[PDB]
């Protein structure tokens, strides 16, 4: 079985660098060309850089050029991409892709690994601040009521939501983060619970970040 | 020289034939590949030097290419084949260059509005000198929606911020959006409102400073 298994991805600031490396196995590594191609989350397939199997040739994509660097070691059957320089447009699953065949004109993919995640951004650590978005109108009395929490500016990912210490799970729908222009990110999460409850049961959701080591309760009322 | 070009989006009913084109200058002088990618997975080749198919892959897919366009055909269309799918090619130029990819919908769920639920800011918030709009959409079907926000009637562009659909629990998608805006703002127009339009009509929800 062909495989290709991504690594080195993370997080790192703009202006910084990185390496990821591609370990290859069950082909002969040495006798093809392999590339890099990179998918922006949600945007198309972007070829990054390639390079023969004999390392006689090596290309890369223009907006890439002079600040990656592509290697290989045959003998250890690895792939690897030197990244300086990085600019926050070079945000994206990186995939390993092995070539049809072994020159740069059979360099289009055929096998492709599982990726490994780069997110390059020049955002501090930050817990979120967390604010309610009390029940209001919406449906009615003997209805049902929506109340939330907006955790806002964040970084890095992931947060985690629960409501009433995890003991409030049926009812809950956490949005994914939105991604801001200050590069900082914002979600938020929503309860459904009966309207007639409102003010005689209580509603605080917890919020966790590990990064920025943050710990949130807050009650949520009308 | 390398642009390639797809339509974002073909839609079959099952066992119907699927079409799905790639167009470039003179693309009939490349070797035409074709990928087809399930959400959270890697590319997977389904076509490769315009018509060749590599073994694993069922009959039911073909390639053309010929001229400006390329061709990726599936047969008896399968639920299983709703992916994004792209075409590649290598030219001297360019080298590796894809197109933009086409999902492709098997008609698979009945069409759902979205929901809308609009959030004005909170006392909490306006006390620490910020407010934000928060705007939630859920349970529609297909995932595709338009977001745009009012003050009072006249359109805003200032502050907007919308996530892209993702895919939920009971097969339809939730998207969220929010406008940020400082407090004076805030009490400067005498209502907002999102108004959601998702493949056909618009939903709009409405807030009003107090």
């Known amino acids: 079985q062909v495989q290709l298994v991504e690594s080195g991805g993370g997080l790192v600031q703009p202006g910084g660098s990185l390496r990821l490396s591609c370990a290859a196995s069950?082909?002969?590594?040495?006798?093809?060309?392999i590339n890099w191609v990179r998918q922006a989350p949600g945007k198309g397939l972007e070829w990054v850089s390639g390079?023969?199997?004999?390392?006689?040739?090596?290309l890369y994509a223009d907006s890439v050029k002079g600040r990656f660097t592509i290697s290989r070691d045959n003998s250890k059957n690895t792939l690897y991409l030197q990244m300086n320089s990085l600019r926050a447009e070079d945000t994206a699953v990186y995939y390993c892709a092995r070539g049809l065949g072994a020159f740069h004109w059979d360099m289009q993919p055929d096998y492709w690994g599982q990726g490994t995640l780069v997110t390059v951004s020049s955002a501090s650590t930050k817990g979120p601040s967390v604010f309610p978005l009390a029940p209001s109108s919406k449906s009615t009395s003997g209805g049902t009521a929506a109340l939330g929490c907006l955790v806002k500016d964040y970084f890095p990912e992931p947060v985690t939501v629960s409501w009433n210490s995890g003991a409030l799970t049926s009812g809950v729908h956490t949005f994914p983060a939105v991604l801001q222009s200050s590069g900082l990110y914002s979600l938020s999460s929503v309860v459904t619970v009966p309207s007639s409850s409102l003010g005689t049961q209580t509603y605080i959701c917890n919020v966790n970040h590990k990064p920025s080591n943050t710990k949130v309760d807050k009650k949520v009322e009308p | 020289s390398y642009e390639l070009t797809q339509p974002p989006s073909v839609s079959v009913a099952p066992g119907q034939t699927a079409r799905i084109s790639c167009s470039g200058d003179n693309i009939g002088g490349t070797f035409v590949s074709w990928y087809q990618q399930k959400p959270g997975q890697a590319p997977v080749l389904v076509i490769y030097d315009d018509n060749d198919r590599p073994s694993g892959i069922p009959e039911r897919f073909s390639g053309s290419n010929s001229g400006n366009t390329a061709t990726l055909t599936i047969s008896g269309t399968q639920a299983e084949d709703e992916a994004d799918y792209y075409c590649?090619?290598?030219?001297?130029?360019?080298?590796?260059?894809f197109g933009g990819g086409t999902k492709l919908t098997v008609l698979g769920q009945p069409k759902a509005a979205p929901s809308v639920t609009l959030f004005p800011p909170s006392s909490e918030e306006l006390q620490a000198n910020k407010a934000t709009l928060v705007c939630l959409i859920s349970d529609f079907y297909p995932g595709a929606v338009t977001v745009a926000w009012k003050a009072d009637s006249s359109p805003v562009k200032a502050g907007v911020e919308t996530t892209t659909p993702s895919k939920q629990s009971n097969n339809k998608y939730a998207a969220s959006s929010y406008l940020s805006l400082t407090p004076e703002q805030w009490k400067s127009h005498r209502s907002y409102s999102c108004q959601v339009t998702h493949e056909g009509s618009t939903v709009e929800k409405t807030v009003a400073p107090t």
């Open positions: 069950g082909f002969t590594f040495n006798s093809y060309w």
């Open positions: 390079i023969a199997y004999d390392s006689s040739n090596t």
């Open positions: 590649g090619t290598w030219d001297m130029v360019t080298n590796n260059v």
